[PDB]
């Protein structure tokens, strides 16, 4: 029997993506994929009734229908989930961390998920290391970072 | 028999300030089956026979708490409980990281004398991502 979607938690994320979401339904299995509108993402299989995905980025805020796909075949077109994308405005403590989890480099032999303290440590290291640079590298990095910031928050 | 159990918690972490929505994933749930965080009864709600929606309580102290289920004084999952981890913004480990960053973060026109933790993280991340390929 085919995979179905019964609930999505959370049912709402930032347009920048990267948010962990739990898809709850029936008949899930390994290698299944989740469709956010038209965007495919892969999913980690928790149990046959729960699947874990990371929200893909979307350039426009609003409702998207959520469906499932295996090997380019689509399920749930008749009973879709709904996920909502919102525009990110004010940064938050929780977002800053999710963000750091993605961008912070991992020394060999780390856990799959770095503890908040490590992130803050490594982050501190690299930002200090930037201050002691040829300035030619500094102007570029700061211009880059300013571009990144301008694109996420508006 | 049809005895309740917990395969996973999502997320498995939260702040001591509480309020987080968490999904409890397992088999054999039903209307009225209740969720316990240590010994406190948390607000729960059935989604399907396989997923319960809870909302975390505040906690005075960080640490791992065992999550169990219970119905009519009878208590399940004591053998192999779910484990939710509470962390606080004030663990020395965490607060140190923040101070370091507070001094290392560049200042723009119109900045407070101390930068909100959100701002430290935002800028930190932006600079760390920009450091790629370099």
Swiss-Prot record, chain A:
Keyword line: Activator, Developmental protein, Disease variant, DNA-binding, Intellectual disability, Metal-binding, Nucleus, Transcription, Transcription regulation, Zinc, Zinc-finger
GO cellular component terms attached to this protein's record: chromatin; nucleus
Keyword flag Glycoprotein: no
Subcellular location: Nucleus
UniProt entry tagged with the keyword Transcription regulation: yes
Main location: nucleus
Domain of life of the native organism: Eukaryota
GO biological process, one term: positive regulation of DNA-templated transcription
Reported disease: Hypotonia, ataxia, and delayed development syndrome: An autosomal dominant neurodevelopmental syndrome characterized by global developmental delay, moderate to severe intellectual disability, cerebellar ataxia, hypotonia, speech delay, variable dysmorphic features, and genitourinary abnormalities including vesicoureteric reflux.
Family listed: Belongs to the COE family.
Quaternary structure, from the entry: Forms either a homodimer or a heterodimer with a related family member.
Name of the protein this chain belongs to: Transcription factor COE3
Source organism per UniProt: Homo sapiens (Human)
Residues of the full protein shown: 261 to 414 of 596
């Amino acid at each position: 029997a085919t995979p179905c979607i019964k609930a999505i938690s959370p049912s709402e994320g930032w347009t920048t993506g990267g948010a962990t979401v739990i898809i709850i339904g029936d008949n899930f299995f390994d290698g299944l994929q989740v469709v956010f509108g038209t965007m495919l993402v892969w999913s980690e299989l928790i149990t046959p009734h729960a699947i874990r995905v990371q929200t893909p980025p979307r350039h426009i805020p609003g409702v998207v229908e959520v469906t499932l796909s295996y090997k380019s075949k689509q399920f749930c077109k008749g009973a879709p989930g709904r996920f909502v994308y919102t525009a990110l405005n004010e940064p938050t403590i929780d977002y800053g961390f999710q963000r750091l989890q993605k961008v912070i480099p991992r020394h060999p032999g780390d856990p799959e998920r770095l503890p908040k303290e490590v992130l803050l440590k490594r982050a501190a290291d690299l930002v200090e290391a930037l201050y002691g640079m040829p300035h030619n590298n500094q102007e570029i990095i700061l211009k880059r970072a300013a571009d990144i910031a301008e694109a996420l928050y508006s």
